[PDB]
Amino acid sequence: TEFLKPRLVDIEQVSSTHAKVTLEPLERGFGHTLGNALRRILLSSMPGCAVTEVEIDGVLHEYSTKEGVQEDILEILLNLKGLAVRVQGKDEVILTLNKSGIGPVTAADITHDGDVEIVKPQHVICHLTDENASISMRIKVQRGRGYVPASTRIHSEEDERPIGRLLVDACYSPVERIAYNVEAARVEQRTDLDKLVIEMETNGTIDPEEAIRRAATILAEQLEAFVDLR
Template sequence: MIQKNWQELIKPNKIEFSSKKKTLTTLVAEPLERGFGLTLGNALRRVLLSSLRGAAVTAVQIDGVLHEFSSIAGVREDVTDIVLNIKEIAIRMEGDGPKRMVVRKQGPGAVLAGDIQTVGDVEILNPDHVICTLDEGAEIRMEFTVDTGKGYVPADRNRAEDAPIGLIPVDSLYS
């Protein structure tokens, strides 16, 4: 009986992958039984999000800032908003181990992810992403720690016991 059930299922005969962006791939498998597409898609998404390795910012140190509830003169966003914007930076990194990146900018204008000075094997995938906005005469310097991992790691697990004062841990979404 089980053998008969599997033989009567509609099995996909066409599977295509298409990449339109560096961070997005579409998989098309057809034809499928009614309702199987959603079931297979959710299972595949969950497995990929929990299993794929990626890179993310794990900590940031901003000159003149001691904690994430501070504000910076001449910067429109407070440090909490800046950290939220930093979490959205998409990064590709070859190799393992933590890497350091720095951004230094003077106002007026927006500080973009593309302004970050990266090391050789680190690439910013969304260079137009706004980190913060500077007013006339304002200046900011931030140093980021980037690492590789899987899944999601909350900020409290990114905090080293011997971390210097002013190092702000960041939630890391690696996938």
């Protein structure tokens, strides 16, 4: 019996969004085996950040609209869902967006807190039309794996929210796209061995490297069950 230990080798980053990761040496057949498991767990179980909650001033509910503000409330919600967020220590942070005057409100305009990294500072949220137009809010950004909407949270929600507080459907999963290409890999003499090539796109949030490790990790952890109890 000759088992093969496969090692993490190549970690190219074409863009901040896109990263190519090559894994050799893969024994024959396990190209596909790993390809699938990886992918599945990647997208569903990868912890990411997303806007969870919002209090906007002069804003009672998602349907109405404030003066001098181009976007509707719901639409601004959509923008915030899209905001790519990197949190260091704490799990739930309250970002404060305060902008005045005529201008397009980008993520940079948010007051910049220490433990937070804004992945897409250029990301628009809203457009302030009127010169006297003033927008303030407190937006809650949480960590989470996969997708939990407003309606799931609200069901078991003993967490009684104040009036005006606007829950957002949480698009947590930072993984936007991911596929694998199994291609036979350059062994200086051996033929049959292959590399796994992962083509991967995310919204900045998770780093390519860390993604890999944590994916394989949880996979392994789940494998515990079978090996352990008989």
